[PDB]
Design a protein around this nucleic acid. Structure first.
Lengths: 129, 24, 158, 145
RNA sequence: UAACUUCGGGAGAAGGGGUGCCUGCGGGUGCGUAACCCGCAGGUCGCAGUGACUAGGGGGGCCCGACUGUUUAAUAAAAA
RNA sequence: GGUCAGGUCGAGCCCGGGCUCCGUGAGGGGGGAGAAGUCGUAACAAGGUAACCGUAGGGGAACCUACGGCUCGAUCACCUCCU
RNA sequence: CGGCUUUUCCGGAGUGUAAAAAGCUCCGGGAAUAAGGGCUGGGCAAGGCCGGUGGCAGCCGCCGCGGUAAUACCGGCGGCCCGAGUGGUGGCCACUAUUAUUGGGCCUAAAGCGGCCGUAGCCGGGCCCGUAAGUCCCUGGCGAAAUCCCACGGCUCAACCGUGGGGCUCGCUGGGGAUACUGCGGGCCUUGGGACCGGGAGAGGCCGGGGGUACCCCCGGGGUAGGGGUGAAAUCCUAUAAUCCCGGGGGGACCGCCAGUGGCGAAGGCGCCCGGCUGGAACGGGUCCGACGGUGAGCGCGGAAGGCCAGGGGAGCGAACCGGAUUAGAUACCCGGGUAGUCCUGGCUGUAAAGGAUGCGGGCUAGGUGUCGGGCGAGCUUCGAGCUCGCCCGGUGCCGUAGGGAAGCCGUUAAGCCCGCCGCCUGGGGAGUACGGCCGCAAGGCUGAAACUUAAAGGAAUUGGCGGGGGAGCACUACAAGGGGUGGAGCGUGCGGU
RNA sequence: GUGGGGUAACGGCCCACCAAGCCGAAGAUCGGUACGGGCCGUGAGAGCGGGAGCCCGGAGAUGGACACUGAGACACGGGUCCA
């Protein structure tokens, strides 16, 4: 069986981008992927995406702008204090500018910069840049 | 090579274990 | 899609319909579909085969879709229909069929024992039963005062 | 996975993994046990005095031939035989047999000698509690008994 | 409670402690206070409580023969 | 405060055994050094019997041989590939 | 050489002491007046000459230097560093993502368990709802001073000290809030998983039955003097006759061609044919359960050949062995005999270059070609998917894009890109040894060190040389073919030796 | 577990009776090594290593055992006693 469905989906979505493919089809599909995709889209990394809800499985078909440099998930999904954010911010993110080290917070799901603006935080879900 | 060694180790083990056995 | 378990060969590419409500080009009433299920169960056909007959003959691919809504706590699909009438086996059709077959091998080993392959198969079948049984205990299709062993298996079959 | 568990609860597995995998270092395994302290005599000490049993010369290594000046000493408290290599040219002349001698390691305590010397683990600093490097130069101090 | 080991044994190893009489209890089996047996506490005398009679000294190496048995009925019971 | 009974806290001393650590012995094995002798030519080229390997026996020794494996395998041929 | 100032140092005044000293501080007197230690070859270069010495004596942290013109030694001279220090030996951290959490590997460099299962453990698809344990936010109780950092202030300066702010191993506590994520509880779904029906391929397994080839033997006939064996040979066999040839009968082991770049199996591994029993496996149709899932320490199980055990068998083969040859010798290649074993049954043993030196599962990432098995739409038909084109599903091979790789190679059958989980590695030899323990009948297996010693061990690829390695091609210092000659003699001549 | 003593005081601390538990692979037990903490050393960090003056707490006073006197001691420069 799979686990971390987001990791797999991200791993595909990045490998997709690396190729320069027109669109992506991610077969195993979720809230984790879809909420992350909606936060990704909201920043502008991806274009439009449609999910047909098949009686078997959602499929997401994601448009690739070409803006994503890398998007993958975080192996343990560690807990990280808002004071620890800055440690993580240098490690993972390529610069101060990019600021999607997606964290899931009390507020709902936010990017890294959006997580900051409210101020709040939680367990590390993934990154986008 | 590797045969050399196995028989040396076995001769060492068996003569020495003979000296253990006949020290036994 | 596939998974290699006691083989390196992929699993069948077959799929369900992606249908989510049913043909109205196929037509049966709730009263009529319960009757079809019950009749086939009476024969001694099992619930897998019962649906097989209903898809080929009566043109109904999966029960769930056709029936419910008619009582929308959950789907009305073959062993549920049967559970309400009291026609269900208490043991689940998954667990029953695995066990039965396991008793049949044993008999071959008895007259014949010099089998590498058949012997090994007995290991394989039993291990699946441990997993299938361990989860069922928790959910309540099997009490927790049970445990799996091969005389206890011959006692269920017989 | 590349190898090691990663799970929030899993941490003990990693904690044990490193300690076990750490011992694969000889030097780490050695100091922690105290195989360094115990084995190469001294009792871990920086130096030791001993009495000169005799002056012996040892031959040089695979390229080399030369009679290197050495003292066989007996360390006092320890009560062990050490072979200790005398520095400076003229040096062996100053060491009178049965004087008090102070002995140090040379070039890692690890057991390794200089390349040229075979068995010698050690250095001789002192004769009758004045160092050889002093005795090399005429003016400074000049020896006794 | 060791060496050894054919795991059966070695082993009752070895070594150390206790044990009497009285006074009072408890348990077991039973049936009702019989017939016995197994423990527990206190008090107390002697040099010594299995006081008598009955009653193994122990430990280790080696040689031979596996063992038990048999043997020169009556100078040799052993390794034969 | 005396002596004396019973009882209690209670070392060192002695004995026996258990666990652990150090020095050290007839005799007997290999190990890393040594410049130079001896015997043979083992591997490295198909090393002049391809090599290795697991196992088993033998030979002073490197080793040889059986069986089964493997090519990290040998020569053009071969076969087969590929072309 | 001219001028200037003038640290220690003297003398004095208070101080301080609540006795000195510490002699400061103030003032008078007053001198250019304490500087050393390492290195100088590559490494570090940061720094070069002469003399002496001559693979010595020494130098030494490593690589190294000294074997008669040494920049490396010794001394001098000169230069570089650093400076009241400088340098040696030892220990610790760094460098060492050589312990990998940040941040490491495992095809061939060290390293994949010979394969599996499933337990502990880790990890887990979607949708809804409750709680809010993890998690995040806020408040608050609190984690001494000191050390550390920042500010200001104090001591001539600064070290240090005062004050003010921050942080601290920061492991504990209470209340309020958020609910994405995670944990728990409940409900809900079919993509994963398991399950069903029906076609179907195959050297999977077990059992029964059953044929023939060849080898061997035995028997009769026929038929003479050799057969066999090799590079040559010998041993050997054979004269109550072998080899051969013909017929007859017995025995044990196996099943060329078929047979494929082929099929099957978890792995070890698996080939006459036939039937029965029986394992796995593909596809179409998801027809049935409804996350039941993945991995898996421990544990359990199968595991060639060889060995062991009991019992039964034995043609051919053949360790050991016995001859013969070969060879300098041959404990060998080569030949001629031969026992264990090779066969069966039962048990044991438990290894391997047990290989694809590549643990398992899922997702994503150019393709091309051949091939096996399954589905489909046609043409062909001997009307059977028999021949064939393509799409697709499962499987096995080659080639190759992007990428990875040190390269060789790998490249949808990953060594790519990810995630989850296991085993294992961390320089070499010592040593896969010693002990100890466990297992085994035994042989042996499993586990598994240290003393000591080394600047390599090692992998790929390059260039050349080399090969009783291959292919092509010439030669006359080549070989053959061929003619003449040296080696024999006497002498001339050069040499060895004397 | 029940009841009881003893202590300043809970409590298998001690004791009588009763029960058969308790502890362990999320590594007990045993062996080794060690005062612990604030801190410290190094290191970009993470991390590693360390317990030194000082401060904070305990432990000890030739080795072992023991009371008295006092709020407090089983008492470094008080006593008894064995070695």
């Amino acid at each position: 069986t799979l686990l971390d469905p987001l990791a797999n989906a991200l791993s595909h979505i990045t490998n997709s981008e690396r190729v320069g493919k027109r669109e992506v089809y991610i077969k195993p599909a979720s809230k984790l992927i879809g909420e992350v995709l909606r936060v990704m889209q909201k920043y502008g990394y991806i274009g439009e995406f449609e999910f047909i809800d098949d009686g078997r499985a959602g499929v997401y078909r994601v448009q690739l702008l070409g803006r994503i440099n890398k998007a993958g998930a975080i192996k343990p999904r560690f807990p990280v204090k808002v004071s620890e954010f800055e440690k993580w911010e240098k490690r993972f993110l390529p610069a101060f500018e990019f600021g999607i080290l997606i964290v899931s917070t009390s507020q709902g799901v936010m990017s890294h910069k959006e997580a900051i603006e409210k101020g709040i935080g939680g367990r590390l879900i993934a990154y986008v840049y | 090579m590797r045969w050399k060694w196995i028989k040396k180790r076995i001769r060492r083990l068996k003569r020495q274990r003979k000296k253990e056995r006949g020290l036994i | 899609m596939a998974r290699m378990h006691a083989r390196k060969r992929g699993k069948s590419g077959s799929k369900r319909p992606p249908r989510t409500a049913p043909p109205i080009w196929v037509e049966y009433t709730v009263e009529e579909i319960e009757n079809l299920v019950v009749k086939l169960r009476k024969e001694g056909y099992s619930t897998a085969m019962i649906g097989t007959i209903l898809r080929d003959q009566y043109g109904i691919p999966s029960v769930k879709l056709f029936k419910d809504p008619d009582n929308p706590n959950r789907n009305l699909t073959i062993t549920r229909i049967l559970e309400k009438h009291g026609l269900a086996p208490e043991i689940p059709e998954d667990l029953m069929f695995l066990i039965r077959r396991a008793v049949n091998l044993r008999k071959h080993l008895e007259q014949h024992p010099k089998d590498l392959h058949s012997m090994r198969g007995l290991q394989l079948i039993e291990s699946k039963i441990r997993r299938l049984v361990k989860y069922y205990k928790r959910k309540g299709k099997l009490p927790k005062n049970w445990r799996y062993d091969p005389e206890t298996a011959k006692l269920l079959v017989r | 996975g590349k190898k090691a568990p990663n799970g929030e609860f899993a941490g003990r597995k990693l904690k044990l993994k490193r300690k076990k995998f750490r011992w694969s270092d000889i030097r780490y395994k050695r100091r922690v046990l105290r195989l360094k302290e115990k084995s190469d005599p001294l009792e871990g000490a920086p130096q030791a005095r001993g009495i000169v049993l005799e002056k012996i010369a040892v031959e040089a290594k695979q390229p080399n031939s030369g009679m290197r000046k050495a003292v066989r000493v007996q360390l006092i408290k320890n009560g062990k035989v050490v072979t200790a290599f005398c520095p400076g040219d003229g040096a062996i002349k100053f060491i009178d047999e049965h004087d008090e001698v102070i002995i140090e390691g040379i070039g890692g305590p690890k057991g390794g000698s200089m390349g040229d010397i075979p068995g010698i683990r050690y250095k001789v600093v002192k004769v009758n509690r004045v160092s050889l490097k002093e005795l090399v130069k005429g003016r400074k101090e000049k020896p006794r008994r």
